[PDB]
Symmetry: C2
Subunit: 342 residues, 2 copies
């Protein structure tokens, strides 16, 4: 049962997804789609794809694939997911999931009514270091977690790879903070209330590139999500997410260079949580690139057995509501009940 | 020529102040005062102070000192500052300044009508590393500051040397966070608005021992004041305050071991901001103990020069409001307007 997938949106990051599909056991890419025949041709030759489509409606009409991997930008997401549901094709969707929390819910509802899986490609929680933090806290090595911090502070030029980032009136939460919020959820549970502040420091972008978010977790823990693309440090940590967790029995400290300090009753342990460097990977992206293979293999496995995925459309609504809360909060000075939004 | 001071409250921390007055150029301690006959004996004998009093009223009646140094616990701060003003004797008063913001304002007003200097003994500000960070930022090394973190996370047994801390129904913001909020003002200026979460983790005490505070500075900067005494680290940082600052041209990062790191236009510097170990000083408190010499020497200088001190009673109202806002916000769950309190 070698699953045959189709990829819609042969863009900058989709090249990572295509490399990873070769490595994925039990699945591979049978067709591709793109409105930009330059990208369709370039990706098509690179990964040796016979079937190529100028529009996604033709692709879905011909079929011959078990699942669809949507790697377009947010504009196309809702329709391509709706197309996928009408044709009963299981769907993976990049982030941001949708333009609003409304769009995301209808996208979750359409796929449930159709009885098809819907994973959101949210690969930050699928990195080795992040999993190691979860693994540690899951064991009980530091007792009940009560306080956390999640940090992604960088001066790396993401705007060359992704020019659209500088164009929007929204930027860092929508794009990057969405991940860091997903990790806060993934480590400390769902969020009851959220308060946020944003700022634009960089004068060559239309959007906020610094954000600081304070999270009240349902489980009792407080956490800090702080992100910036205007932080100029001695060593560029990009694209690492630094994490501190305190609990009743101990502390976790995931720091720059993937050094992982855990301290408990028995004592301290220092562990190297560095990612693997895959054959097609490229520094410093190798961290994220590995997590593409992790989440795509996870999709394939959960699909082949029947189960729900980790970042299912259903799950991802609870991450996406923090993003939407954050912007709301940023324009009011005021806390947002997350429970009321869902 | 040397100024004559009188010390009211010969407890635990007053012993550091006494040593420092010895070292301070231009001042000494002519008289000590304490309500406990055994403390009055111990400190009096250790520092060879002839004049000893069981009550401040008798002390103030006899007079013969140019300033008073109040190092009692918070309950008797108002009465002693009010006596000081009634006898026109310049006053140094410990933290916490008063029991409420109401009391503090009234104490500041009393000292202005009597027309005497009033300085809150708020010494964290005067630590070598904390001054070093101030100097970097003033230099303009990193441009305009836009974001800060001020962190004091320890598992140290402070309860032995000060039993009242466990007893208080309010703990960490009143005791330690007052320092970290003062530092946030010192580095990034006054606060427009404030929002705070707290919890008690230690089963043994009655007060909150973890606080996470998010500050909106008038100059546009945002910061996180996070403090804890229920934090179990593999190397105990007590009593260091770890500071992170981001500005438009660079960053400051003061990490454990008084390691100051500045990144700017002209590369990146690393310096050692650790304090002197004074003859009478003793690790790991040499941090705080040096600042006592600094602030008291600063007071003498300023009382001689007729200049208003750095932690003047009136300035310290803008710190104290943040403590009173943080408790209020922790209960509310709602952002507090600072300017309205003042
Ligand atoms: N960590 C991650 O998982 C990660 C990393 C980078 C980017 N992303 C996300 O991936 C998405 C794409 O990022 P990118 O930088 O590759 O953008 P991109 O512009 O390079 O890629 C989008 C491609 O999709 C095509 N496209 C758009 N609408 C289409 C439609 N209706 N049918 C067919 N093709 C269509 C465009 O021609 C373009 O080539 C973004 O939403 C971004 O948030 C995720
Ligand atoms: N870094 C610092 O600046 C620092 C460090 C520790 C404590 N403190 C502050 O110092 C203050 C005292 O701390 P401590 O640990 O020395 O407490 P303590 O109980 O050891 O000392 C206070 C002393 O004052 C005496 N006293 C109280 N009321 C009096 C009155 N009306 N007249 C005469 N004597 C009186 C008591 O008998 C006691 O001996 C606290 O308010 C605390 O916030 C500051
Ligand atoms: Mg394959
Ligand atoms: Mg002297």
């Amino acid at each position: 049962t070698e699953l045959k997938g189709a990829l819609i949106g042969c863009g900058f990051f989709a090249v990572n997804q295509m490399h990873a599909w070769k490595d994925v056991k039990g699945a591979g890419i049978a067709a591709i789609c793109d409105r930009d025949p330059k990208r369709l041709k370039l990706v098509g030759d690179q990964f040796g794809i016979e079937r190529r489509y100028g529009d996604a409606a033709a692709l879905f009409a011909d079929g011959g694939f078990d699942f669809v991997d949507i790697a377009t930008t947010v504009q196309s997401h809702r329709a391509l997911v709706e197309m996928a549901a009408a044709h009963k094709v299981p769907a993976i969707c990049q982030k941001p999931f949708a333009k609003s929390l409304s769009d995301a819910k209808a996208m979750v509802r359409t796929c449930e009514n159709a009885d098809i899986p819907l994973m959101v490609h949210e690969n930050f929680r699928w990195q080795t270091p992040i999993q190691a933090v979860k693994a540690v806290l899951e064991s009980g090595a530091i007792g009940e977690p009560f306080w956390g911090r999640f940090s992604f502070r960088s001066g790396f030029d993401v705007f060359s790879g992704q020019p659209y980032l500088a164009e929007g009136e929204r930027f860092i939460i929508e794009d990057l903070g969405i991940h860091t919020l997903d990790i806060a959820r993934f480590i400390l549970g769902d969020v009851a209330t959220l308060t946020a502040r944003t700022k634009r420091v960089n004068p060559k972008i239309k959007g906020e590139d610094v954000a600081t978010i304070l999270l009240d977790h349902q489980n009792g823990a407080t956490s800090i999500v702080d992100v910036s693309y205007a932080t100029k440090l001695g060593t560029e940590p990009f694209p690492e997410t630094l994490i501190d967790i305190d609990g009743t029995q101990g502390t976790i400290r995931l720091s720059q260079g993937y050094r992982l300090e855990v301290t408990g009753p028995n004592g301290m342990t220092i562990s190297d949580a560095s990612p693997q460097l895959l054959s097609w990977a490229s520094r410093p992206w190798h961290n994220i690139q590995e997590s593409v293979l992790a989440i795509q293999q996870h999709w394939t496995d959960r699909l082949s057995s029947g189960g729900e995925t980790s970042t299912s459309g259903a799950d991802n609504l609870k991450t996406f509501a923090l993003v939407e809360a954050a912007y709301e909060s940023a324009a009011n000075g005021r806390t947002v009940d997350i429970g009321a939004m869902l």
